[PDB]
Amino acid sequence: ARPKLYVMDNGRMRMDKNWMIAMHNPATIHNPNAQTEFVEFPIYTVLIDHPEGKILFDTSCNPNSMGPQGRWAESTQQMFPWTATEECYLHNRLEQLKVRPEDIRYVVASHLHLDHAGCLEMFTNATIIVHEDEFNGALQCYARNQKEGAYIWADIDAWIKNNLQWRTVKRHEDNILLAEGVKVLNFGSGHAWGMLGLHVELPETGGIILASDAIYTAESYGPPIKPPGIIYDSLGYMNTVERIRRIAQETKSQVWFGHDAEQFKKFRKSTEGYYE
């Protein structure tokens, strides 16, 4: 198999750096009212154009997220603002590659946060691969009518109305061979209820791990590890980063972080080419 892997730029988000790096600048007797900063980072998605069928990793934010008529609650829009030109929307990035939503055989949802699961509703011809614990947690947010936080009610509403086809990865489930040189990694609980990664083996480029929010940035990754400011499972988070470090060492793979502005700058994006 001679796949082509594309990095698609789906715009920029800002938030409190304390979300990204917990207690990054603690108050002191000399700086008792210490200030945070509002840091900018990329949202992106990965397309694997594979002869056995097209695989998409993450789906970015819904085009209807922001604004007075937006799906995102006003508090969410103010703490986690997303900025994107029309060329950044996932449907346009895919159209520029001559890829219609119906051509996607698999969507791997790293997790179901607003900045990863925003366009799942497009992929009505795919199998949506998601962690069972992540799916359960998001569906409880929906059933409880939660309007704030990182699980977007109107996104989930659209997944159910559009009759998406789900394959849940079970809590103790091995790492799933999707296609030649493409493996779903079950990271389990950490950043969210259930995290999935991807291990891709390309003939030219060699190994790539897509970590998504298992590892926000190179600063998260250290060593030593700098965890995020809120976390579902701190122990699982720390175990997941060290497991990724060991897999990268043993397989000589690059690690692609979820939201690293400096790493993302260096990628070849879908407007310039691809990785074989």
Place this chain on the structure above:
Amino acid sequence: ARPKLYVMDNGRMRMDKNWMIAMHNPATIHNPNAQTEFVEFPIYTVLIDHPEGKILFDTSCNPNSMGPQGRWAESTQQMFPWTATEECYLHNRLEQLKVRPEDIRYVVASHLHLDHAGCLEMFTNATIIVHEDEFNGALQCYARNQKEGAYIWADIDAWIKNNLQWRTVKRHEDNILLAEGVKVLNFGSGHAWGMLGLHVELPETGGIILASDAIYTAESYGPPIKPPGIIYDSLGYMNTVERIRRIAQETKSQVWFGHDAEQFKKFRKSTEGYYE
């Protein structure tokens, strides 16, 4: 048994409120450089004068913690400054009750942080009850020569030189009857590697849960729960708070928080009296 329980005031600490309440005031598009606060809170200890023998819960900070010749690293003194008059030192609070260090039969160390294990070295005639996972973690900090952070090298150094007598609570160990109406609760990992609480049943006052840093304040406790800015085991922390809530409900017990300024103000301290 007709015990007397004393609350001893061991002075005041300040730190970034984000340590106390994770992401208490997140940056927004309108407040992108949001300021934290440097909040003040009590350090205290509990003496149970029991006919079966005196039980101490926690030991506050070492009198030699602060200052240019202090045991605390300079970064620790600046992020977690302790202020205490000599009357606040545990040795003096106990002397004012005519209690010598040698009169303590049991010391329950909730955990081994700087603000709880600072005077263990005084209690050479006691059995020191500690969670096995907390002891292991602190002893690794000692062995790796760590000088910064919440585990004070020079305090651990004095515990070993003074030949303290340890009883470790094992990870799966039940809740230990120390004396009539005094039970050690094994909370397990959460805030730190291994947390112990106390459930005291007094004839007049009824039930008291000493939670220590399993629950910092009433704001932590909610509901809903507001976790602290850094945590060893987030899942264990959240389970521990709900377990304490259920025990309080099923036994009609008061919950005494680790560091709640408003609750502490309402306690009768060792200069005014005691609880029977």
